[PDB]
Design a protein around this nucleic acid. Structure first.
Lengths: 151, 206, 100, 79, 127, 99
RNA sequence: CGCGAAGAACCUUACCUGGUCUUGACAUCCACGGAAGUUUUCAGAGAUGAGAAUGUGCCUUCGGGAACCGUGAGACAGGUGCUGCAUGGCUGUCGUCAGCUCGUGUUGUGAAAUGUUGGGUUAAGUCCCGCAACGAGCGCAACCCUUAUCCUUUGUUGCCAGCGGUCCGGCCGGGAACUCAAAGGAGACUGCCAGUGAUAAACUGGAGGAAGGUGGGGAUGACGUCAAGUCAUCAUGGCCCUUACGACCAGGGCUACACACGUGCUACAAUGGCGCAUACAAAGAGAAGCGACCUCGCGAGAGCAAGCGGACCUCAUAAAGUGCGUCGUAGUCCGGAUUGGAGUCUGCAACUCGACUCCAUGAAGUCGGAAUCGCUAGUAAUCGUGGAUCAGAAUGCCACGGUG
């Protein structure tokens, strides 16, 4: 918005871990204001994760997340007809948001049984970096380097 | 744009109601339909008598009509005579036993209803409409109305296309709720159909 | 509405007070009751022979002023149009514009 | 359906049918009662029920009993 | 001694008594664990007893009417923290900074003539 | 005997004049008065379409508030029943009296 | 384009078919006859047409008059007939956008201009400073309702902290603390601190505070714009019909269906479906009404019958949620359309055409081309609850809280 430069809202930290960055992940995963059942799915699929990649439950997230975190993206921009994809160096906070959001659009796409399976296997494969959330980060780092000309 | 009714937005702030009786849901629709007919009567009778405002309350069983009017003499007739033959056709229309009162209106130039009735009268005996408006504004302002607009509408001097000339003088603040804006309205029935006449009358605030 | 259609809703009230309110309120119980008589109803056949506008079903509400069938409001006995005209003059007591 | 405390018919149909069973079958009855349950005692007769303009001949079979009279005059033309 | 607070949030209205001595949490004559069957709602009634100290230091008997789960939680949170500032006083500094003293003003916006809800307009069609 | 007076009325200033009469009238003629306790307040609501034809989103939402007051009297004298029966209030108050 | 219509089976009803009436279904005036009313009667689809009884309310310078009904001829009635491009009233719209004007002065032959522009600033023609302008008005803002903290008063039908007793139920002594109820007050004003700024208006930050810079929400719609909408709410000038374009009735129709569009609801499923237990709301309504308990029914419901004009009783078990079981990616224990059978209820009457129940049946549909809509926070999303209209007929409309 034009005038209206603004603050932002304190989310509560996550009750089990005390992890403010993981609360944002249940919000992103939540549908229809059912935060309850988002938490069920997440807390589950970190048990299934942290067990099968040598422990640390905060830090099995933050290895898988660090892998998908971007560093540049495009930002399309008209000059007078043809339209210039400009690479632009992404903010600290928006790094995580895009990462988290891509993890979940990847997880929501697969064909395992539960969601807590689907999530656990697209946090496994992030940390050993294949599967669709890093195929997203790679096909964004193409676009930034393919259009590195324009900045 | 269309304005909110200035009487109606100001009820229970600075204007009071005119029907001031309590009911429950059995008898509410009936009281309304009585109070309608007791007003629809007393307008038709007292047309010459210059009537601002017919308050109705209902204590006990009984109905109690106050009338406000410029001309107490012509309602009271002689020794009442007329008051007392209003009561016994009112007390049919209600059903209950009745009680008429009267109040004066000291300045008929400052009542909206009477100013409008006045102007509406002159338009039926074929007076030029700009005189009729402009008399009424002057008259209120020399008796110390803080302001006043009037607004006639629709086939003026028997034109073939409707217009609405209007004419303020002084201050008339209609978004101020605190303001006492005496307002009212009237239809002139002419040979060129109807002409409608609004009148606002600011009298100061609180 | 018309003068005819306002006259029709006096005709239909005139009946239903005289008849059904007493006499059909007998026969609607004789047609009901299972634990008394199941053969000499006779009453089902007699409920037809009452005039048809004795039923309160057949009464529409009109706005006790303009006679308008739609837009009715039971508390006031009035169309939505005349409620509002009367509200704003101050002829309906206690009624003001709300906000919350 | 009319609950099982009643089935329904108009008196002016009931009594006009009692006649032309008892007296003997005839030129058809002209009813406007479309709302009237076909009873057992009506079988064989032609009744001519009103569709909204023309009365329409209906030979009352055995299989019709229970159905209403109005079911055999259609109201609306269509192609 | 009984140290009292009221607290409110949405339609919930909690009333909160603070006794000295021990760990224990009552709430409409049930255990804290019985009443709230969600972990998120538990660690917001305890929140104020963390910045300010409790393991086994004050009991609390509380009752709550109205709203739902996370409403009732938030009312109790605020109810405690009023009652703490009755008892000690000079804890306000720390409680204010987490901002549990702020009565949470957010009601549901009413529904509005014309709209399907508070702000949800119906589907527009140009032509 | 307990007699109790439910006063109800559309105007909130008109009703608690009529109350404050009754609390004075009983105390002076020798009785212990309870209240005047405020009961809750039926607010009705009527939305109406506002145009004479069409324009379904043009509306006008009215209310009637009904204010309600209760005054219990625990000790009746023989005066105190007749002191209140003989009283007459404004038109917009509705009194009741149970026994 | 879920718009009039806050609810077409009959009614409604304005439309069609057929059957009827002509000073009339509705009102006033005069004349003459009868108190009003009651009660069955056979025709007829019904409107309608042909029969037994019954008082006399009331005063009578007693004629009859008044309540009310039929008959009689004309003044008339009647018209949801035409014109919203003859009108009033009411409404939409640009738009809650910050604008729109006037007086007196001045400039210009004049239309006009200035003010109202400029420099700052504001949500704002908001405020300050300037300047041939000085002032004023309608608007903005405030004054109103609601919500967010506290105080005072007042405690039943609401409340239960500290006291005793218990059928473990605020239920019964009692208590007036607390929630809550609804009256009356306090509180927030850039008021205080720092810095920025032409020492101005203001702005950025800070403190305390329940709330901070119009704290959130509503109501409030300037001059005007579109010959915008409505003569079918009502009113109304003119034109028109007057044994019919008026009026009464029964049946039909407004529900038709090769199609095209709008707005919704339900879906396509494991963030899920079914089964069993279990928790936490708000706001409403109710006497030709809401209807408990108990009994009958698989169920819709039925029978009996307290209470309640209602902080007391009833509608009325909130549902998402939670725990435990189960289904395993399948057109399926996903989905419920459609059709058959059997019922229930409202209603003179559910054929045309009501809703709800039970058994059976189990279409399309595996996230939707071009295109396109809504939303900035208790919002969107999702979950239930109530109301008006209403005999019955809500996926619509208006309102309420939950999660978020």
């Amino acid at each position: 918005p034009r005038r209206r430069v603004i603050g932002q809202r304190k989310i509560l930290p996550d009750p089990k871990f005390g992890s403010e960055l993981l609360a944002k992940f249940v919000n992103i995963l939540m549908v229809d204001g059912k935060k309850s059942t988002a938490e069920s799915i997440v807390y589950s699929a970190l048990e299934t994760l942290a067990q099968r990649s040598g422990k640390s439950e905060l830090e099995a997230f933050e290895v898988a997340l660090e892998n998908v975190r971007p560093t540049v993206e495009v930002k399309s921009r008209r000059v007078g007809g043809s339209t210039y994809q400009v690479p632009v160096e992404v903010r600290p906070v928006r790094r995580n948001a895009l990462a988290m959001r891509w993890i979940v659009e990847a997880a929501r796409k697969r064909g395992d049984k539960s969601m807590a399976l689907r999530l656990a296997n697209e946090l496994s494969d992030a940390a050993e970096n294949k599967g669709t959330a890093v195929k997203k980060r790679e096909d964004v780092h193409r676009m930034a380097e393919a259009n590195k000309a324009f900045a | 744009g269309q304005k909110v009714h200035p009487n109606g937005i100001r009820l229970g702030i600075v204007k009071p109601w005119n029907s001031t009786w309590f009911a429950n849901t059995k008898e509410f629709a009936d009281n309304l339909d009585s109070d309608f007919k007791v007003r629809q009567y007393l307008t038709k009778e007292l047309a010459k008598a210059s009537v601002s405002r017919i308050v109705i309350e209902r204590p006990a069983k009984s109905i109690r009509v106050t009338i406000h009017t410029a001309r107490p003499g012509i309602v009271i007739g002689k020794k009442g005579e007329d008051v007392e033959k209003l009561r016994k056709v009112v007390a049919d229309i209600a059903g209950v036993p009745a009680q008429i009162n009267i109040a004066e209106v000291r300045k008929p130039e400052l009542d909206a209803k009477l100013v409008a009735d006045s102007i509406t009268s002159q338009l039926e005996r074929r007076v030029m409409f700009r005189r009729a408006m402009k008399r009424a504004v002057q008259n209120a302002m020399r008796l110390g109305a803080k302001g006043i607009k009037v607004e006639v509408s629709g086939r003026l001097g028997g034109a073939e296309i409707a217009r609405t000339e209007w004419y303020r003088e002084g201050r008339v603040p209609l978004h101020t709720l605190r303001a006492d804006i005496d307002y009212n309205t009237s239809e002139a029935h002419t040979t060129y159909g109807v002409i409608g006449v609004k009148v606002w009358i600011f009298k100061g605030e609180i | 509405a018309k003068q005819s259609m306002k006259a029709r809703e006096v005709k239909r009230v005139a009946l239903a007070d005289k008849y059904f309110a007493k006499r059909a309120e007998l026969k609607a119980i004789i047609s009901d009751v299972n634990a008394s008589d199941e053969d000499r109803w006779n009453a089902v056949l007699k409920l037809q022979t009452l005039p048809r506008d004795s039923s309160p079903s057949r009464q529409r509400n009109r706005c006790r002023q303009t006679g308008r069938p739609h837009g009715f409001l039971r508390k006031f006995g009035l169309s939505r149009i005349k409620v509002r005209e009367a509200a704003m003059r101050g002829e309906i007591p206690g009624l003001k514009k709300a906000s919350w | 359906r009319s609950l099982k405390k009643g089935p329904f018919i108009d008196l002016h149909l009931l009594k006009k049918v009692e006649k032309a069973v008892e007296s003997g079958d005839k030129k058809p009855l002209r009813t406007w009662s479309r709302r009237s349950t076909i009873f057992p005692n009506m079988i064989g007769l032609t009744i001519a029920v009103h569709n909204g303009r023309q009365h329409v001949p209906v030979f009352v079979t055995d299989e019709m009993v229970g159905h209403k009279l109005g079911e055999f005059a259609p109201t609306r033309t269509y192609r | 001694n009984q140290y009292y607070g009221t607290g409110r949030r949405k339609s919930s209205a909690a009333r909160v008594f603070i006794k000295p001595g021990n760990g224990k949490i009552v709430i409409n004559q049930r255990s804290l664990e019985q009443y709230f069957g969600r972990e998120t709602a538990r660690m917001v009634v305890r929140q104020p007893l963390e910045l300010v100290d409790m393991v086994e230091k004050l009991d609390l008997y509380i009752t709550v009417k109205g709203g739902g789960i996370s409403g009732q939680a938030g009312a109790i949170r605020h109810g405690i923290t009023r009652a703490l500032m009755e008892y000690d006083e000079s804890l306000r500094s720390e409680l204010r900074k987490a901002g549990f003293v702020t009565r949470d003003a957010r009601q549901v916006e009413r529904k509005k003539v014309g709209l399907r809800k508070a702000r949800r307009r119906p589907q527009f069609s140009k032509r | 005997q307990r007699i109790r007076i439910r006063l109800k009325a559309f105007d909130h200033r008109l009703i608690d004049q009529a109350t404050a009469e009754i609390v004075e009238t009983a105390k002076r003629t020798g009785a212990q008065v309870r209240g005047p306790i405020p009961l809750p307040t039926r607010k009705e609501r009527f939305t109406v379409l506002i145009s004479p034809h069409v324009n379904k989103d043009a509306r006008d939402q009215y209310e009637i508030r009904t204010h309600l007051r209760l005054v219990d009297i625990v000790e009746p004298t023989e005066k105190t029943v007749d002191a209140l029966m003989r009283l007459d209030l404004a038109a917009g108050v509705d009194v009741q009296i149970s026994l």
